[PDB]
Amino acid sequence: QQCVKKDELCIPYYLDCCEPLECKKVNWWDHKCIG
């Protein structure tokens, strides 16, 4: 699947972010793209 831009949501164990971001939890409830 496509990547994910930083600041954009996402789902752990489903989609992944572009790079070097990481499609995971950005906080404790909101899941987006990090690094």
Curated annotation (Swiss-Prot):
Peptide that strongly, but reversibly, suppresses the sweet taste-response to various sweeteners, including sugars, sweet amino acids and the artificial sweetener saccharin. In rodents, potentially binds to a sweet taste receptor present on apical microvilli of a subset of taste bud cells. Highly effective at blocking the sweet taste-response in rodents such as rats and mice, though mice may possess a mix of gurmarin-sensitive and -insensitive receptors. Has almost no effect on the sweet taste-response in humans. Expressed in leaves (at protein level). Disulfide bonds join 3-18, 10-23, 17-33. Changing residue 29 to A: Abolishes or severely attenuates sweet taste-response suppression properties. It comes from Gymnema sylvestre (Gurmar). The presence of a 'disulfide through disulfide knot' structurally defines this protein as a knottin. It comes from the Eukaryota. This is Sweet taste-suppressing peptide gurmarin. The modification Pyrrolidone carboxylic acid is found at residue 1.
